[PDB]
């Protein structure tokens, strides 16, 4: 997570007055299925 | 000016130049010796 609260930042040639705020969330995800035969799935239609 | 809540976009400044000049000036006069010797006044030079 990053966060640039409004103030001295955003303050940039885009926004000299610096009136914008920013918060970011980044992450990494990945998985591997060792034994697909160990995973069972049934499909159906309910009411 | 009108700063909207968004912001993002100005004023400038200028300076001007003043120029002077130096000009030469002067004059002169002449006199003969006889003017000084044969003058009614003896303090004409002064």
């Amino acid at each position: 997570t990053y966060t640039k609260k409004p103030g001295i930042e955003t303050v940039s040639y885009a926004d000299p007055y610096g009136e914008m705020g920013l918060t970011s969330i980044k992450w990494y995800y990945g998985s591997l299925i060792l034994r697909p035969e160990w995973i069972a799935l049934f499909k159906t239609v309910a009411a | 000016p009108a700063l909207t809540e968004n912001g993002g976009r100005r004023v400038g400044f200028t300076r001007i130049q003043l120029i002077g000049s130096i000009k030469k000036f002067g004059f002169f006069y002449e006199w003969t010796q006889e003017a000084m010797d044969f003058d009614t006044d003896e303090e004409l030079d002064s």
Side-chain angles (χ1 to χ4, degrees), chain A residues 1-4 6-9 12-47, chain B residues 1-33 35-42 44-46:
Chain A
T1 167
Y2 310 111
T3 291
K4 299 180 215 153
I8 204 54
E9 321 101 280
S12 65
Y13 75 113
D15 190 19
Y17 312 100
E19 280 281 293
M20 315 276 318
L22 180 51
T23 286
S24 178
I25 325 291
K26 272 109 171 184
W27 80 83
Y28 267 138
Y29 161 75
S31 76
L32 175 52
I33 297 175
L34 285 96
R35 297 147 174 284
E37 83 276 6
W38 283 24
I39 291 324
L41 177 53
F42 207 95
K43 320 219 182 135
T44 167
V45 180
Chain B
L3 204 31
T4 168
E5 33 189 279
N6 325 296
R9 294 208 263 170
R10 196 175 60 152
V11 74
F13 311 97
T14 85
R15 49 151 158 88
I16 64 153
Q17 178 172 93
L18 314 168
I19 306 124
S21 60
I22 319 278
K23 292 334 289 169
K24 190 166 208 195
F25 300 103
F27 58 94
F28 80 98
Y29 59 92
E30 317 156 350
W31 69 90
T32 74
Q33 186 67 263
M36 331 315 297
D37 323 288
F38 314 137
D39 193 66
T40 45
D41 194 38
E42 290 326 284
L44 182 156
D45 57 7
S46 78

